[PDB]
Design an enzyme around this catalytic site. Structure first.
Site, mmCIF file in Angstrom:
data_model
loop_
_atom_site.group_PDB
_atom_site.id
_atom_site.type_symbol
_atom_site.label_atom_id
_atom_site.label_comp_id
_atom_site.label_asym_id
_atom_site.label_seq_id
_atom_site.Cartn_x
_atom_site.Cartn_y
_atom_site.Cartn_z
ATOM 1 N N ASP A 147 0.863 -1.199 0.000
ATOM 2 C CA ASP A 147 0.000 0.000 0.000
ATOM 3 C C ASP A 147 0.893 1.239 0.000
ATOM 4 O O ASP A 147 0.838 2.063 0.907
ATOM 5 C CB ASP A 147 -0.962 -0.018 1.178
ATOM 6 C CG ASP A 147 -1.884 1.182 1.150
ATOM 7 O OD1 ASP A 147 -2.097 1.743 0.051
ATOM 8 O OD2 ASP A 147 -2.361 1.587 2.232
ATOM 9 N N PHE A 148 1.788 1.322 -0.963
ATOM 10 C CA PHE A 148 2.635 2.527 -1.138
ATOM 11 C C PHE A 148 1.826 3.541 -1.939
ATOM 12 O O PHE A 148 1.167 3.120 -2.910
ATOM 13 C CB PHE A 148 3.938 2.115 -1.807
ATOM 14 C CG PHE A 148 4.780 1.256 -0.914
ATOM 15 C CD1 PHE A 148 5.660 1.859 -0.041
ATOM 16 C CD2 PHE A 148 4.640 -0.128 -0.884
ATOM 17 C CE1 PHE A 148 6.433 1.097 0.812
ATOM 18 C CE2 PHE A 148 5.424 -0.890 -0.040
ATOM 19 C CZ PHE A 148 6.314 -0.277 0.809
ATOM 20 N N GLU A 149 1.875 4.826 -1.568
ATOM 21 C CA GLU A 149 1.016 5.869 -2.194
ATOM 22 C C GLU A 149 1.819 7.101 -2.614
ATOM 23 O O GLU A 149 1.211 8.128 -2.995
ATOM 24 C CB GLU A 149 -0.081 6.222 -1.208
ATOM 25 C CG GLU A 149 -0.855 4.991 -0.820
ATOM 26 C CD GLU A 149 -2.198 5.293 -0.220
ATOM 27 O OE1 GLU A 149 -2.467 6.472 0.098
ATOM 28 O OE2 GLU A 149 -2.974 4.350 -0.114
ATOM 29 N N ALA A 150 3.138 7.000 -2.571
ATOM 30 C CA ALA A 150 4.042 8.046 -3.080
ATOM 31 C C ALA A 150 5.175 7.334 -3.799
ATOM 32 O O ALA A 150 5.252 6.078 -3.707
ATOM 33 C CB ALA A 150 4.538 8.894 -1.946
ATOM 34 N N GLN A 204 -8.217 0.789 -4.789
ATOM 35 C CA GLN A 204 -8.941 1.821 -4.020
ATOM 36 C C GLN A 204 -9.814 2.605 -4.989
ATOM 37 O O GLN A 204 -9.320 3.558 -5.636
ATOM 38 C CB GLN A 204 -7.957 2.753 -3.308
ATOM 39 C CG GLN A 204 -6.932 2.036 -2.442
ATOM 40 C CD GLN A 204 -6.009 3.029 -1.778
ATOM 41 O OE1 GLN A 204 -6.447 4.042 -1.238
ATOM 42 N NE2 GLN A 204 -4.715 2.759 -1.831
#
Length: 303
Positions: A147-150, A204
């Site tokens: 769940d990496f978001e950058a 998501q």
């Protein structure tokens, strides 16, 4: 018996960050392991890798920091609860990164590979020849959610090394999931999921115009909701048989684009028409259990 690749009714729910943000809204993990409808739980989050950091919101109150790393927690209640949940037939993954991960990945493939081996020694099988700290003691996770978001440099090399270790392991099956946002392609985990086979991808479909809030009920021509784009991509991905979960907010406070009622039933009926569809994901357990009746709506939409 946990994740079921042959079911279209899997439900993965995140636990640990207390999105609902009240004193009483996040009970201990095992409180949520008597739910016949929730077969996968993602523990959120290992929010630092190099150096390691764990955050479990107010579950941290029952942990003790390790003496030489105050941001890494020793959590005997989470340890016991992982074992209880697994005995109860739940798949328990550790979620890596999350929205508070700020370390930006690794400068080299070698550094990423070393970081993966450390995560495996910390959370996989206990290694008798290792000095690494183990937040969950002798509990062993059932795999990892990405769940990496950058931007996360060399996340593909990190993922490939961790997958090498799980592929070599005895004992039990280890699972890999990723949680891209629905905007296609995903900037943060795109390179990872184009390089490393996943068992499922829990998209998501919220906080973005492509989310379930953009679905148009009554038609199968969808200009905003982009499940079809993700299925087309999935069929030529490193695991061409990878499954998709439709990730949604579990309450209006959990993210932008919460849906309920007929919008929720209709987007799930549309999504169920696709061969990759395997169920739902929700952010998060605290929001779901506070939102009276919502879990029943999701279960009834998947039936």
């Amino acid at each position: 018996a946990g994740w079921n690749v042959n079911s279209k009714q899997n439900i993965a729910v995140y636990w640990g960050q207390n999105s609902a943000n009240s004193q009483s809204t996040q009970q201990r993990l095992s409180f949520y392991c008597n739910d016949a409808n929730i077969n996968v739980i993602d523990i959120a989050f290992l929010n630092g890798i190099t150096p390691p950091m764990t955050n479990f919101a107010n579950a941290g109150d029952r942990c003790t920091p390790f003496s030489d790393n105050p941001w890494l927690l020793q959590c005997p209640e989470i340890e016991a609860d992982i074992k209880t949940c697994q005995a109860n037939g739940k798949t328990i993954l550790l979620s890596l990164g999350g929205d508070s991960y700020t370390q930006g990945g690794w400068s080299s493939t070698g550094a990423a590979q070393s970081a993966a081996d450390q995560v495996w020694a910390m959370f996989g099988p206990v290694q008798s020849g290792s000095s690494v700290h183990r937040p969950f003691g002798s509990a062993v996770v059932d795999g990892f959610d990405f769940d990496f978001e950058a931007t996360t440099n060399n996340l593909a090399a990190f993922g490939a090394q961790l997958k090498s270790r799980t592929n070599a392991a005895g004992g039990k099956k280890y699972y890999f999931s990723a949680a891209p946002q629905c905007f296609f392609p995903d900037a943060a985990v795109g390179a990872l999921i184009n390089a490393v086979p996943m068992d499922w991808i829990q998209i998501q479909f919220y906080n973005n115009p492509c989310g379930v809030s953009g679905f148009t009920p009554g038609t199968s021509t969808q200009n905003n909701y982009n499940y079809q784009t993700w299925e087309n991509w999935a069929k030529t991905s490193p695991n061409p048989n990878v499954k998709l979960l439709v990730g949604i907010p579990a309450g209006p406070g959990a993210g932008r684009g919460y849906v309920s009622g007929s919008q929720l039933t209709s987007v799930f009926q549309y999504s169920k028409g696709f061969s990759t569809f395997a169920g739902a994901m929700m952010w998060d357990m605290s929001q779901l259990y506070q939102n009276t009746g919502f879990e029943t709506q999701v279960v009834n939409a998947l039936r």
